[PDB]
Structures are given as C-alpha cells and as structure tokens.
Amino acid sequence: NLNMDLLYMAAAVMMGLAAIGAAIGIGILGGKFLEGAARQPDLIPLLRTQFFIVMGLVDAIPMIAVGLGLYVMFAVA
Amino acid sequence: ENMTPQDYIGHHLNNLQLDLRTFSLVDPQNPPATFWTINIDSMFFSVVLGLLFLVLFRSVAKKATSGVPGKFQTAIELVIGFVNGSVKDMYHGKSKLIAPLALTIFVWVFLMNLMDLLPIDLLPYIAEHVLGLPALRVVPSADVNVTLSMALGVFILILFYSIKMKGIGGFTKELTLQPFNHWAFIPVNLILEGVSLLSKPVSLGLRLFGNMYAGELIFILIAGLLPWWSQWILNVPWAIFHILIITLQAFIFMVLTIVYLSMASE
C-alpha cells in the first residue's frame, strides 16, 4: 500500500521546493527589474526584453521539478 | 551524604512551599496537589528586598538637602533623575502614579535579580543546617509566580488607563475596527487585538522569568558537575555576564511598563 501512499508525499516535497525556488528567484529578479524601470522609464522595453531573457534560466530547473512531480503524482501514482 | 550530581542539581530546583490547607511544609519528595501552597522562601526574600529598598530611600527622602548632597544621597538622586528622565522621555500625561511605579519596578526587580550573584549554596546550606528547613532557593525573580504577579498588576493598570483616558467607546472602537478598518473584518479583528493585548503582560513576565531562571540554572550546573578546582574558570566568566543581564532585565521591565501605560492613554 505504501508504494501508493508515499509517492504523493514524494511529489509534495518536489513541488513545494520547486515553488519556493521559482517564486523567490523571480521575485528578486523582478524587483530589480522594477527598480530599474522606475529610474529609467524610457528603457522599459529594453529591460523587459533582458528580464524575459534571464527569467527562462531561473525557470529552467523548477519546471523539471514540477513536471516530474506531476508525473509521479499521476503517472506512477 | 549520598548526593549524586543529578540529585544535588534536583534538590536545588525545589521551592520551600507551605500548604495553606494546614499551614504545613510541603516536603520535596511528594508534592501535594492544590493551588493553595505558598512558596515561602521567595515571598520573604521579596518582601524583605522591597522593605530594604523603601527603607533606604525613605531614610534619605526624609532628610535630602538642597546644598551639596552627601555621597550617599547623591547615589539615590542619580537613579531618581534617571527613572524620571526615562519617564519624561516616554510619557506626557499628568498621572502621578507612573513615576513611582517605574521607580519601584526598576529598583525592586534589580535587587531581586541581584540575589543571583551570591554563592548558590550559601544561604541554602545555612537554611538547612542552622535552621533546619528542608529546602531553599533565594532568587525571587527566578520563580514564575512573582514575575507574572507584577505583569498582571501592570495589566490591570493597562485596562484601567485604557478605559479612563479614552472611555469604553474609543476602547471598543480600537479593539474592533483596527487593524483592517472595515466592519467586515471586525470578527477577526477582535482575536488579533484581543490576544495582542494579552500578549504584552504575559511576555513581560516571561521575559524576566526565563532569563533569571536559566541564569540561575547555570550556577546550579557549574556547581554540581565540575570539580571544585575547575569551577571558577567557568563560573566567574558567567557572573561577569549576568551582571549585565540583571541590569538589562530590570531596565527593560521598567521601560516597557512605562511604554504600555503611556501608549494606552495617549
């Protein structure tokens, strides 16, 4: 039975830590982007481009985590 | 005398309770169940230290002169102006109560804490052998019941002043409407501000209790565990730090008392 039960916890930890990492990293990076926007409002279309360029790197691993969590919760269950 | 170090440390954490059902001394091995069992050692040392404070201050308040003050009068007036300035800095009302209350709090708590410095087993030894009493511990502030006693007194003052200086109407408004400011959030607002009101006196009492209890408990440990020839090198570096602690833990009590009473009315 435990082969069924524990897996929901093993995905629980994965999708908790993924959420903390992604939320905190994007919060920091977006905060710096916002302070840059407030000072150089004209550069907004440039800083936004660079912000999106960089965000895909922080979002890289957390989505491995979240997809493996969904798999384990539904695929192997 | 078969004191195992784990048992000697035990006896030191025993109060000298007297039972009020029969006015009898509660022995350490069996603790009777009841709420009616006064801790006698501490209440004595507490009333005695308050008496010593008041006598010292009165034998000068009845004589203080406006010339060049004596070397002893000067020491008292120093602390008088210190507490008076701490009050004036954090209170502007006309109440005559606040200044003497803070003076008594500061000096009395300071003296009670001062007991912590003495050799742990001096007075307990004299109390067992010379007099015959079963147990004694001589730090009043290292006991729960006194500290929260003062906290509940100051709490009753918080309520008295909160009612007097802004009336039941403003008091009920503050309790309910804040912090979310909408009448939709009143139900929750009462819990938060209600306990947060309760948090002040409880935390006041426990700030003093925990520090004094666990600063005493060290001397009981250093005394019991280490051999006599090694005790000093860990004892004195602890007392040199508790000399700072005993002062800060009375000054903070005075200051927070002043603050809770002044922020309640204004």
Binding site: - | Q17, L20, P31, F35, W36, T37, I38, N39, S42, M43, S46, V47, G50, F53, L54, F57, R58, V60, A61, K62, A64, T65, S66, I76, E77, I80, G81, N84, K96, L97, A99, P100, L101, L103, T104, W108, D143, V144, N145, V146, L148, S149, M150, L152, G153, Y213
Partner: protein, 52 residues
C-alpha cells in the same frame, strides 16, 4: 514551572510598595531636586539681568 497561589500573595506585596512609595518616597525627593534646580536657574538669571 508550576503556577501557585504565590502569584496572589505577591500582588498584595506589590500594590502596597507602590502606594507607600508614591506618597512618601518620590514626592519629597523630587521636591528637593527641583528646589535645587530652580535656585541655580533663577539665581544665574538674576545675575545676567543685572549685568545688562
């Protein structure tokens, strides 16, 4: 640790030391200190007034 009736006995000792202090201890000591302060303040004030 263990709560006790002592929390009640100590509330008697506390209140009583606050009243005797409030009445006898504090008022006279502050009276004497202010009596010194006023004298030096106003004496020097008289001194600078006559100088001009």
């Amino acid at each position: 640790m263990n709560l006790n009736a002592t929390i009640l006995g100590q509330a008697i000792a506390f209140v009583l030391f606050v009243l005797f202090c409030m009445k006898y201890v504090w008022p006279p000591l502050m009276a004497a200190i202010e009596k010194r302060q006023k004298e030096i303040a106003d004496g020097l004030a008289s001194a600078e007034r006559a100088h001009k």
